[PDB]
Design a protein around this nucleic acid. Structure first.
Ligand SMILES: [Zn+2]
Ligand SMILES: [Zn+2]
Ligand SMILES: [Zn+2]
Lengths: 72, 186, 596, 187
RNA sequence: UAAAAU
RNA sequence: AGCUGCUCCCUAGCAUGCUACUACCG
RNA sequence: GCGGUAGUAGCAUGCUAGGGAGCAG
């Protein structure tokens, strides 16, 4: 169950990086630290907190058309 | 290998030797079955060794064109496969804390900064319509990311403050609507 | 080297090479296209020829797959296979192929000549894929036909830019307009290098033609000007994206209290935003165009882009935008071509301006929130696909009227095109119904709206703005001084010569004629700045001067008469050959010596 | 394979053999003109398989000298490039300040680490946090390396300009934190 | 034979 | 964008080696 | 009937050259 969230955080940081988010050093530092801290977690309840904090970065900007990719 | 032209000649030659060895004729006329049969095992094995090499160039062209096609289609679709993979894994994860913000985010209610974790930093989220405002803001508590945030300052697109008691069904049509609610975690 | 079939969208690698646009076809579809057409060339990963040195057989239906190559039957190897066999041709992904039975319409499009009305009539009733296919192949056919025109060289030098040329005898000479250009090459012995592009203009007398050079290379006696052709880029996005409805307003946030001058448009302003795309059809000179900027400020924070196929249209609506919006407004029209120039406002290079105005062929690839394409009666499916390809936005809005003017479509020479088949969105507006309707004149005199609504429309127009000054002296027109197929008649100009100064206050009218060259005759002996009836259509002025020609099928067109008379404020005149149009005409009859 | 001295010899030998096979008179015919594909293929072995290696070795020699020619062109290209670099780099230093410090050397040679210290005309400070900016380049003119430098143009990690009014202590947590202050040498 | 393209 | 070490896989060329069978002589 | 060279086809080894990939400090 924690391996699930670790691989998901890998995919999330890769998407964020593809969206040119490392053009702003503050944001990229925040996301990088959240990612490396998720990968080193050792109890699945902190990982989900930092995952919601990390996904908020993608939900912020409007570059990914969310209503389309949510066709379920 | 079989239906190659010279296989016919070789087959007739060795059938003639079958006939000769069944009849047991002369050995000097048998000099026609190893001066004209061994001429076949080299009239053939040099035309069987020219489809054994064509049959190998075929493979090493097929097995190369295939991967040259895929290995290039794979790199021409990363920004759209990564996202579908991401959301597949997210939906499979099943965590209400993430489903909440994802659904919310569908109906134009996004946040404006990283969701903080401290029991006291700020969160500024957009709210586009009233029917959104009802389901989340009951009085002064804001229900986002499966938590409870105490609402402190609402401010419409006028960039000027709105009073919380001013927001209701009737007087709603007047406010520049996409608002920005600010709150702090419980 | 792989794609999708044009009919069933399956995986393939075959192209019917004899077809001009080289479209991908699957196995079964390529077999069907080649078993019933003169097209029998195919190209897969490599062309399908007889690979024996000296053989040139190319008919696919008789070729044979040999060793690592395809061979004629005469040059067949001892071991081989036939390519076209069992109702299919051999390509990649053979056993996973889906065969659509649209080969009838496909062959129709592939072998047609675009010369009779049936070709366009079937171009706009097929699936979307075939729609785009027919569009690009038709444009290709036209611009390659343009190659059959004649060529011109020097004859003698007369000045620095008005000289005498020699058209090659026996082949059609191209029309003389500033958008038909020829590149010039000098060939001395030796020396055949480009000297520049040129656009010409027949000046005051023959055979002299004033010209405009791209660079001051001093013209000599041995050069020539050959028309330079253009290429066609294939399309991708459909003509119109599929519709979606909503239950609440999405992406757009209205207002309550700005400029109720756009009063009756509010409920419609909402219906625009609660859909994915909608159309507004309007009789000439009504709330259209007005509606565009009205919705624009009704949604102030909304990014909006405006577009049209004709330059004068986008310019006139940019003017009407300047009349009402913050500036904060740019018209990213054209950097430095379309030599009949345009606006004087801002920028062509920024694309952060909330209001961008341009013409379809020069659109940048931007994001938007609303795209207001204008006058869909003049655009073709090609152009609609161009806009849907370059831009993406949230909503789309199309405004026009199919009863006005269509696209020229030069090569068609028999039959008539009903507006239903002008393109896709005109079809949509007349098949089920403009999903948005607005119809009563604001602009031109009440009486002339009565005239026009009496004839093209069944009568359904009313307005204000009454008299005065309207006249149609049925004027004999003399010598059809026809140098180019565009007509010229200056005995007809003998009426602005009959009314040069006796109009002491009618000084800023606008002169328009169906023919471009007789309008350059208005630019020959000058009365006022003049326009064409095509550079009108979405343009309005106070008083209008108009001249016709003989009763050719050209000028007799009721639609051009519509778009010629309906563009005034309170005065017009019609000088017509006239067998029954002055029996159509609802004004005061005059004569040539009738100056009072 | 075609126009060689052996192909025609084999051709005439087998033509005579054709005549002799159409005859079919004696076994001496069979022997003497089976000594005609037995004698005319050795030359068709030698002078028709030997020159099948002549082209081999000629073509490999050709490709080797092709590649040597290209590898001798790329050398010229790289030496031109590095010569251009060397000559454009010295067109930035020939100050009289450099001659001034070299002529004071009691030998002619001076350590390298001091040349940009005493002769450069532009300094660039990289500052991690605000507390360090406070103690170092505070104001618009500061002193370092025993000279007086004057600030102009301040940027950040993202390389976008910053005015010294934003560099306050409560506004410090709103900037990309390694700032790059570029100053000039003011006399 | 009407518009008009890095 | 480093210096090494080991291992698997594919292709090419050459000579050597090996073997079969065919042609010339001894 | 055998010795010698010259061939083709087949086979194994070894060595050079070229490319791809994995691990270790
Ligand atoms: Zn065809
Ligand atoms: Zn098909
Ligand atoms: Zn052939």
């Amino acid at each position: 169950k924690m391996s699930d969230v670790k691989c998901t955080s890998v995919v999330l940081l890769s998407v964020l990086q593809q969206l040119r988010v490392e053009s702003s050093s503050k944001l990229w530092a925040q996301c990088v630290q959240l990612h490396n801290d998720i990968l080193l977690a050792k109890d699945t309840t902190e990982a989900f907190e930092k995952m919601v904090s990390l996904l908020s970065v993608l939900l912020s900007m409007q570059g990914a058309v969310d209503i389309n990719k949510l066709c379920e | 290998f079989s239906s190659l032209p010279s296989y016919a000649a070789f087959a007739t030659a060795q059938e003639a030797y079958e006939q000769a060895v069944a009849n047991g004729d002369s050995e000097v006329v048998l000099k026609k079955l190893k001066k004209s049969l061994n001429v076949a095992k080299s009239e053939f094995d040099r035309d069987a060794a020219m489809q054994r090499k064509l049959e190998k160039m075929a493979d090493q062209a097929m097995t190369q064109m295939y991967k040259q096609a895929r290995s290039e289609d794979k790199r021409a679709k990363v920004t759209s496969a990564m996202q579908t993979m991401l959301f597949t894994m997210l939906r499979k994860l099943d965590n209400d804390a993430l489903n909440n913000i994802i659904n919310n985010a569908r109906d134009g209610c996004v946040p404006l900064n990283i969701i903080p974790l401290t029991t006291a930093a700020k969160l500024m989220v957009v709210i586009p319509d009233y029917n959104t405002y009802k389901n989340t803001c009951d009085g002064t508590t804001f229900t986002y990311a499966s938590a409870l945030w105490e609402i402190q300052q609402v401010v419409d697109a006028d960039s000027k403050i709105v009073q919380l008691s001013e927001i209701s069904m009737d007087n709603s049509p007047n406010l520049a609507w996409p608002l920005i609610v600010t709150a702090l975690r419980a | 080297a792989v794609g999708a079939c044009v009919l069933c969208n399956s995986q393939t690698s075959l192209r019917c090479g004899a077809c001009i646009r080289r479209p991908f076809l699957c196995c079964k579809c390529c077999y069907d296209h080649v078993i019933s057409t003169s097209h029998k060339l195919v190209l897969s990963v490599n062309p399908y020829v007889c690979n024996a040195p000296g053989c040139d057989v190319t008919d696919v239906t008789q070729l044979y797959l040999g060793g690592m190559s395809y061979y004629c039957k005469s040059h067949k190897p001892p071991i081989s296979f036939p390519l076209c066999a069992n109702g299919q041709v051999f390509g990649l992904y053979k056993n996973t192929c889906v065969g659509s039975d649209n080969v009838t319409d496909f062959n129709a499009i592939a072998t047609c000549d675009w010369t009779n009305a049936g070709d366009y009539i079937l171009a706009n009733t097929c699936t979307e894929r075939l729609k785009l296919f027919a569009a690009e192949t038709l444009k290709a056919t036209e611009e390659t036909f343009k190659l059959s025109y004649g060529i011109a060289t020097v004859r003698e030098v007369l000045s620095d830019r008005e000289l005498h040329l020699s058209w090659e005898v026996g082949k059609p000479r191209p029309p003389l307009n500033r958008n038909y250009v020829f590149t010039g090459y000098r060939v001395t012995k030796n020396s055949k290098v480009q000297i520049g592009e040129y656009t010409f203009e027949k000046g005051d007398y023959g055979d002299a033609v004033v010209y405009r050079g791209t660079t001051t290379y001093k013209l000599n006696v041995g050069d020539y000007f050959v028309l330079t052709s253009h290429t066609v880029m294939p399309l991708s996005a459909p003509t119109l994206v599929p519709q979606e409805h909503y239950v609440r307003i999405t992406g757009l946030y209205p207002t309550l209290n700005i400029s109720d001058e756009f009063s009756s448009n509010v409920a419609n302003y909402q219906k625009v935003g609660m859909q994915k795309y909608s159309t507004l059809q309007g009789p000439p000179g009504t709330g259209k165009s007005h509606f565009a900027i009205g919705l624009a400020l009704y949604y102030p924070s909304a990014r909006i882009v405006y577009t049209a196929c004709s330059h004068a249209a986008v310019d006139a609506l940019c003017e009407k935008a300047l009349k009402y919006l913050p500036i904060d407004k740019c018209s990213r029209i054209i950097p430095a071509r379309a030599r009949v120039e345009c606006f004087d406002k801002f920028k062509v290079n920024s694309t952060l301006e909330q209001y961008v105005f341009c013409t379809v062929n020069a659109l940048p690839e931007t994001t938007a929130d609303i795209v207001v394409f204008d006058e869909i009666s003049m655009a073709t499916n090609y152009d609609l696909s161009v806009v849907n390809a370059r831009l993406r936005a949230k909503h789309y809005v199309y405004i026009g009227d199919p009863a006005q003017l269509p696209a020229p479509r030069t090569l068609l020479t028999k039959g008539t095109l009903e507006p239903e088949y002008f393109n896709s969105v005109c079809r949509l507006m007349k098949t089920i119904g403009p999903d948005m309707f607005l119809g009563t004149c604001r602009r031109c005199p009440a009486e002339i709206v009565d005239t026009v609504s009496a004839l093209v429309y069944d009568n359904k127009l009313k307005a204000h703005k009454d008299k005065s000054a309207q006249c149609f002296k049925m004027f004999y027109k003399g010598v059809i001084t026809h140098d180019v197929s565009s007509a010229i008649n200056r005995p007809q100009i003998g009426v602005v010569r009959e009314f040069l100064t006796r109009n002491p206050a009618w000084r800023k009218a606008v002169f328009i004629s169906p023919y471009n060259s007789q309008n350059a005759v208005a630019s020959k002996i000058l009365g006022l700045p003049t326009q064409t009836v095509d550079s009108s259509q979405g343009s309005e002025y106070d008083y209008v001067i108009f001249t016709q020609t003989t009763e050719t099928a050209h000028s007799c067109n009721v639609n051009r008469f519509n778009v010629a008379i309906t563009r005034a404020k309170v005065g017009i005149l019609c000088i017509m050959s006239d067998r029954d149009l002055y029996d159509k005409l609802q004004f005061t009859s005059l004569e040539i010596p009738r100056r009072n």
